[PDB]
Amino acid sequence: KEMPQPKTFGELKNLPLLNTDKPVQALMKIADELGEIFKFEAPGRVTRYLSSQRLIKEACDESRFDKNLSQGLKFVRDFAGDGLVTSWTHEKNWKKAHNILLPSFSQQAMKGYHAMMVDIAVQLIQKWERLNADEHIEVPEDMTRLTLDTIGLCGFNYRFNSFYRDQPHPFITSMVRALDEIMNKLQRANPDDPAYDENKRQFQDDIKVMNDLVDKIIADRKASGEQSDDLLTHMLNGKDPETGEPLDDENIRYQIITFLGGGHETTSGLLSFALYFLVKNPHVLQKAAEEAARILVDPVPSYKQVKQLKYVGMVLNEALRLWPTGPAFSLYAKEDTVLGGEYPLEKGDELMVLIPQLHRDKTIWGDDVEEFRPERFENPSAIPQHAFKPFGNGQRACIGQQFALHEATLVLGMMLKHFDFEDHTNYELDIKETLTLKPEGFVVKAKSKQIPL
Amino acid sequence: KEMPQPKTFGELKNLPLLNTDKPVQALMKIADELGEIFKFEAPGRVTRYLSSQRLIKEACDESRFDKNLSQGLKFVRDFAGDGLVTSWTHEKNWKKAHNILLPSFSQQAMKGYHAMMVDIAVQLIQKWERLNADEHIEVPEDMTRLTLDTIGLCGFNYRFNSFYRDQPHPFITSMVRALDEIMNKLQRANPDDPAYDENKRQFQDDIKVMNDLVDKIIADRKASGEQSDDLLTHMLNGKDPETGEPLDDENIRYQIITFLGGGHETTSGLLSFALYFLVKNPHVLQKAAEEAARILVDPVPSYKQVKQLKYVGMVLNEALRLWPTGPAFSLYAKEDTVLGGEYPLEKGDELMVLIPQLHRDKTIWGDDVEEFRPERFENPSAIPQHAFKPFGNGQRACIGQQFALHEATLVLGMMLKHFDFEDHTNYELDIKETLTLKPEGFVVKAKSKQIPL
Ligand code: HEM
Numbered sequence: 001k002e003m004p005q006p007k008t009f010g011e012l013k014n015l016p017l018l019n020t021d022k023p024v025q026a027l028m029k030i031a032d033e034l035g036e037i038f039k040f041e042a043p044g045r046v047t048r049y050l051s052s053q054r055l056i057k058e059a060c061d062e063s064r065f066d067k068n069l070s071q072g073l074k075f076v077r078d079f080a081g082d083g084l085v086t087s088w089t090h091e092k093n094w095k096k097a098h099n100i101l102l103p104s105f106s107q108q109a110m111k112g113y114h115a116m117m118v119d120i121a122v123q124l125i126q127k128w129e130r131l132n133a134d135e136h137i138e139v140p141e142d143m144t145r146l147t148l149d150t151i152g153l154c155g156f157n158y159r160f161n162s163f164y165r166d167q168p169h170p171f172i173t174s175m176v177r178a179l180d181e182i183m184n185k186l187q188r189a190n191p192d193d194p195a196y197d198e199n200k201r202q203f204q205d206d207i208k209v210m211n212d213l214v215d216k217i218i219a220d221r222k223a224s225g226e227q228s229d230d231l232l233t234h235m236l237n238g239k240d241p242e243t244g245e246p247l248d249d250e251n252i253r254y255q256i257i258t259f260l261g262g263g264h265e266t267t268s269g270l271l272s273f274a275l276y277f278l279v280k281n282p283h284v285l286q287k288a289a290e291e292a293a294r295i296l297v298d299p300v301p302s303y304k305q306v307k308q309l310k311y312v313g314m315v316l317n318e319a320l321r322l323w324p325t326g327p328a329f330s331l332y333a334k335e336d337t338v339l340g341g342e343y344p345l346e347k348g349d350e351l352m353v354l355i356p357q358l359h360r361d362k363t364i365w366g367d368d369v370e371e372f373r374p375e376r377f378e379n380p381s382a383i384p385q386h387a388f389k390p391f392g393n394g395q396r397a398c399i400g401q402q403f404a405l406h407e408a409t410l411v412l413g414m415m416l417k418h419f420d421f422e423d424h425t426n427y428e429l430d431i432k433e434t435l436t437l438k439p440e441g442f443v444v445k446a447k448s449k450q451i452p453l
Numbered sequence: 454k455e456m457p458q459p460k461t462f463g464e465l466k467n468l469p470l471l472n473t474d475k476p477v478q479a480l481m482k483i484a485d486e487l488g489e490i491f492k493f494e495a496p497g498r499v500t501r502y503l504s505s506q507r508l509i510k511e512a513c514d515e516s517r518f519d520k521n522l523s524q525g526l527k528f529v530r531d532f533a534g535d536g537l538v539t540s541w542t543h544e545k546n547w548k549k550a551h552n553i554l555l556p557s558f559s560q561q562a563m564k565g566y567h568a569m570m571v572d573i574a575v576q577l578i579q580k581w582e583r584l585n586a587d588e589h590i591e592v593p594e595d596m597t598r599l600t601l602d603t604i605g606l607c608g609f610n611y612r613f614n615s616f617y618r619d620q621p622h623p624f625i626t627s628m629v630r631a632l633d634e635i636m637n638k639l640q641r642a643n644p645d646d647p648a649y650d651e652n653k654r655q656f657q658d659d660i661k662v663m664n665d666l667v668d669k670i671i672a673d674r675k676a677s678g679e680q681s682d683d684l685l686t687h688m689l690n691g692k693d694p695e696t697g698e699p700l701d702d703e704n705i706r707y708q709i710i711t712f713l714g715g716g717h718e719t720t721s722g723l724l725s726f727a728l729y730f731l732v733k734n735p736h737v738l739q740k741a742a743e744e745a746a747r748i749l750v751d752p753v754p755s756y757k758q759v760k761q762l763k764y765v766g767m768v769l770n771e772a773l774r775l776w777p778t779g780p781a782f783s784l785y786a787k788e789d790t791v792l793g794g795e796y797p798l799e800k801g802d803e804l805m806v807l808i809p810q811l812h813r814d815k816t817i818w819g820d821d822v823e824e825f826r827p828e829r830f831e832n833p834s835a836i837p838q839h840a841f842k843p844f845g846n847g848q849r850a851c852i853g854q855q856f857a858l859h860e861a862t863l864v865l866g867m868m869l870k871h872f873d874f875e876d877h878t879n880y881e882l883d884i885k886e887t888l889t890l891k892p893e894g895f896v897v898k899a900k901s902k903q904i905p906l
């Protein structure tokens with residue numbers, strides 16, 4: 001069968017369709033019009049967007065397709081190098097680092113991070129307890145403070161001290177400016193044009209900032225004479241069982257950058273969407289609060305109590321169903337293949353999985369795919385293979401998934417135990433896109449339940 | 454640290470604890486009571502049972518510990534001699550045979566076995582296709598017919614023709630009766646009593662049928678004048694690269710018996726437990742069956758398609774986590790040493806790894822350790838070293854591991870492609886123990902999907 005394709009702009013083909021603040025939301029709209037697959041052509045490149053579980057379960061066969069670096073990720077590689085997110089599977093440093101850092105997300109490791117997650121969570125709760133009558137909460141801003149600080153402390157014993165700051169930490173300003181520079185690069189006809197010399201001067205400055213903090217984190221660890229078993233411990237000391245080799249210096253630097261960027265943004269998105277859906281669905285908020293109060297019976301949560309917040313977990317999954325905060329991942333064909341018995345592909349051909357659309361496939365989820373209903377996840381194992389993919393696929397799936405979900409479950413649980421929430425502006429969801437998705441301008445009021453912490 | 458010890462029986466010490474049909478399960482229950490290590494005393498022997506990954510990972514250090522023959526294996530050596538399973542690592546014939554036969558398990562060799570594995574697999578599928586409307590399947594019975602036939606045919610070009618029989622083949626009747634006589638001998642206070650002279654004559658009779666079949670297998674091969682590149686070809690003609698020597702006649706006979714025994718029973722257990730867990734976990738059954746339908750698109754599976762059954766592979770590994778079919782292995786201290794910083798051992802001290810307990814270490818796997826969740830094996834690198842050992846350890850690990858999993862993956866794939874399964878009796882798991890583990894009395898109904906074979 002011949003592939004649907006959205007409207008074209010002459011020699012620019014489809015490229016102007018992504019000249020927008022909201023490209024993923026644009027593609028989702030295309031997917032609504034054209035169905036489970038469409039061709040997307042730009043000058044000198046072609047990809048195919050998949051939206052159905054039927055096709056995506058084939059794309060997620062690792063014998064037939066491997067992770068591809070999208071143009072965006074290729075530009076990310078200019079500062080994240082061969083860190084885990086921006087490495088090819090066949091690069092030696094991918095499997096090495098994969099093997100070395102996976103124990104940093106073991107069950108023992110997760111227990112060891114719990115205390116410091118509580119440290120940051122207490123700081124959030126205290127900030128909100130200390131607000132005056134009628135003040136509000138800037139939700140994504142506060143959630144980004146929490147998640148940046150959490151990965152900094154749990155991973156690196158580094159304190160960003162974001163709750164002491166009116167404005168994001170410099171590292172994040174640089175990071176966001178570098179990603180912003182990257183977004184703008186995706187839709188430029190002449191990269192080399194001298195007009196863009198000021199941008200790449202700014203890009204080089206942003207990379208300088210990120211590396212300055214890297215140098216510090218490393219120098220502090222070397223100088224604290226510490227083996228505080230955390231993510232950094234593993235980066236500096238762990239040896240890969242296959243090769244018997246450690247990470248080299250350069251790669252460690254890239255890993256720090258990678259984990260500092262990747263380790264917070266998607267999670268803050270998740271928390272912001274989850275709070276959004278809770279205030280728009282008071283019956284769900286009430287049920288989630290009921291669990292928080294029944295389970296979190298101590299002044300601070302235990303690891304085991306967090307594992308027992310089953311419904312809070314369902315809330316977080318149902319937020320990732322509707323708005324997966326890393327909304328796309330890219331694949332390539334390992335060999336010539338036919339997709340879905342209809343679409344022939346040649347070795348090298350690229351696919352894009354459009355996760356938000358996958359998560360709205362009515363053959364999987366039923367009629368009411370737009371409804372926020374955490375009960376869809378009562379029994380997570382009922383969900384078919386390759387139907388719910390907010391953490392990607394296979395050996396290149398998110399290494400930090402259990403970290404993300406533990407942090408988010410801890411924090412949301414505490415939030416529901418301690419405050420009642422009001423959507424006082426009747427906020428209209430507005431989704432900002434970077435490489436990630438987040439509510440923009442989401443604000444709430446939190447009335448303390450006056451329960452000691 | 455003082456070491457826990459279960460309840461005692463006067464002069465008999467702990468030995469009557471193993472006077473049950475289900476000793477490994479009894480040992481697991483003790484492990485749950487007493488923890489990561491206990492001492493077990495008999496008249497004239499002591500061993501320590503290990504259950505934690507922390508201690509087992511040390512036990513698996515080959516510089517400190519070498520494979521020991523348990524009292525059971527020492528008795529098996531009465532007919533398996535210095536076959537690979539029943540040899541000491543320091544016996545010349547171990548490394549010789551290991552070097553000679555290890556190439557018989559190369560993916561190259563696997564490719565050559567595939568055709569004959571499908572032969573037997575097709576016999577099983579056809580049997581089930583030919584059952585009448587309300588008939589059932591005796592699962593362990595059929596899985597044993599299949600596995601025995603596979604190792605006979607692929608190994609030795611011998612056909613047990615087990616699907617043409619109601620009763621097990623005489624070889625397996627005698628092998629089973631001989632191993633049972635071993636099991637009973639592990640409990641007898643005065644072995645030389647005249648009350649057991651009937652048992653000892655029958656044990657010799659069972660040895661004689663095994664040796665009769667061996668003689669025929671060798672006779673058959675020689676008169677054939679063939680070099681059918683199989684496991685028998687290597688035994689008969691292969692030379693050890695290190696010594697430059699072939700196996701002698703005697704050792705060849707022992708290898709044949711060893712492979713015909715261990716080549717089938719553990720594999721048939723694995724298949725039986727896997728099918729058990731699938732019918733108990735319908736959401737996993739549907740995921741596995743969907744995989745099989747998507748991958749096995751030809752009337753007979755190819756070697757390449759069997760390698761694509763990733764989720765089926767996960768199901769098998771999760772059945773090996775809960776019920777590793779060879780549930781224990783034994784080690785001894787090569788020198789005086791201290792285990793786990795706390796438990797001093799003298800040269801020669803014996804250890805027993807209790808693999809089902811290892812696999813239930815909550816520190817490694819999480820709290821939900823009794824649940825059947827194949828997705829624990831989605832990313833191999835996420836499983837700590839020495840945490841999953843169904844195939845033993847190091848240079849003395851299972852040589853047949855690849856063969857076992859290829860056969861099992863092929864067969865379970867075809868079973869899920871061709872039939873729907875019903876747990877019509879709501880079976881209560883009943884685990885029969887020999888030296889190996891298997892469900893007893895497990896029955897299902899198979900409804901054909903009427904897909905041609
Ligand atoms: C809700 C939160 C998160 C979501 C939705 C998410 C999503 C994803 C996705 C979709 C991928 C695959 C990207 C691709 O195929 O190109 C991925 C990879 C990754 N994620 Fe996450 N992530 C989250 C949280 C985290 C956290 C907390 C960390 C670290 C602490 C992290 C570290 C990574 C890394 C290192 C990779 C690359 C893994 C590899 O290829 O070996 N993520 N994530």
Ligand code: HEM
Nearest residue numbers: 537538716719720723779782843844845849851852853857
């Ligand atoms: C699921 C199936 C199987 C399991 C769970 C399994 C398990 C084991 C274990 C635990 C050992 C080590 C024993 C010890 O340390 O005392 C072992 C050794 C062995 N297995 Fe397997 N096995 C399986 C299948 C097979 C197959 C199919 C074959 C032959 C075709 C085979 C042949 C052997 C041999 C020859 C050894 C001794 C290797 C040596 O020491 O050099 N096994 N098996």
